[PDB]
Amino acid sequence: EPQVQFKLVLVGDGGTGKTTFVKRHLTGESEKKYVATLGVEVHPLVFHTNRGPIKFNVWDTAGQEKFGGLRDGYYIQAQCAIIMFDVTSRVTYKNVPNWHRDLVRVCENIPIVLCGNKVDIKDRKVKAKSIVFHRKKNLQYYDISAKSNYNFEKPFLWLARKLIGDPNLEFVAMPALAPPEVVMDPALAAQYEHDLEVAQTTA
Amino acid sequence: GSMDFRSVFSTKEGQWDCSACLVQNEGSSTKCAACQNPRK
Ligand SMILES: Nc1nc2c(ncn2[C@@H]2O[C@H](COP(=O)(O)OP(=O)(O)O)[C@@H](O)[C@H]2O)c(=O)[nH]1
Numbered sequence: 001e002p003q004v005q006f007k008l009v010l011v012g013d014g015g016t017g018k019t020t021f022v023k024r025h026l027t028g029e030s031e032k033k034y035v036a037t038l039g040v041e042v043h044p045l046v047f048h049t050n051r052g053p054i055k056f057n058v059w060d061t062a063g064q065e066k067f068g069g070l071r072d073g074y075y076i077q078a079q080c081a082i083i084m085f086d087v088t089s090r091v092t093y094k095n096v097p098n099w100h101r102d103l104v105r106v107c108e109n110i111p112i113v114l115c116g117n118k119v120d121i122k123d124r125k126v127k128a129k130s131i132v133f134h135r136k137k138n139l140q141y142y143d144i145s146a147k148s149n150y151n152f153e154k155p156f157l158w159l160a161r162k163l164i165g166d167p168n169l170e171f172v173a174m175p176a177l178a179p180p181e182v183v184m185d186p187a188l189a190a191q192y193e194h195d196l197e198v199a200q201t202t203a
Numbered sequence: 204g205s206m207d208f209r210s211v212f213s214t215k216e217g218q219w220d221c222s223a224c225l226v227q228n229e230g231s232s233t234k235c236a237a238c239q240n241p242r243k
């Protein structure tokens with residue numbers, strides 16, 4: 001009867017693509033819950049692992065992040081988080097430490113993934129070398145493009161492994177996702193993947 | 204093989220799931236710690 005599930009808070013500056021991202025998971029969108037007391041949509045996102053199903057209950061704001069911190073209730077009982085920024089907007093990356101501070105202040109050492117969204121856009125401003133130069137311990141990073149589903153599953157798999165304590169956990173099938181609205185150019189993806197690997201291994 | 208969640212996973216006794224925001228709450232709480240929705 002009981003199902004494994006985690007509260008995941010999705011935070012980051014307004015306009016970074018948080019809502020676009022969470023909405024790629026089709027069943028999470030059709031089964032989302034609106035929490036009137038907090039102005040939040042909770043999207044129940046199921047992923048099927050080699051040990052069975054897990055659900056990330058992702059908390060998506062209603063835009064209030066533009067007017068200062070979120071209320072404590074947003075964070076309460078969070079078990080994990082994604083911090084999002086926009087790789088075309090350096091200001092959104094410069095605010096990452098502020099979101100990270102707010103998270104630990106209420107939730108302490110929950111696992112967190114950092115996502116640089118909109119990598120489908122050619123004129124990229126926040127590149128791998130800068131992201132790795134400012135890499136924070138325990139803050140796993142991924143390039144994502146919500147609009148093309150690029151790397152959609154990676155933040156969730158990393159968090160699941162940390163939460164369950166099972167480094168060999170796998171997703172046996174991708175969730176049903178909204179069809180890509182833009183093409184993630186393969187040449188651009190290969191370049192960004194290479195740039196990341198170089199930054200992470202270069203001496 | 205036997206580490207499947209159906210065999211090894213169970214929730215705290217008396218735990219209840221908030222019908223409004225899905226947060227899992229203590230049996231001793233009358234309201235949701237996150238969103239204040241009352242327990243059913
Ligand atoms: N090119 C591109 N645009 C995106 C992406 N994700 C979101 N956008 C757009 O960025 C704008 C803000 O998106 P939204 O999801 O509302 O961001 P939020 O305020 O963080 O929830 C919108 O115009 C999106 O269409 C992406 O992966 N690629």
Ligand SMILES: [Mg+2]
Nearest residue numbers: 018019061063
């Ligand atoms: Mg939004």
Ligand SMILES: [Zn+2]
Nearest residue numbers: 221224235238
């Ligand atoms: Zn609640």
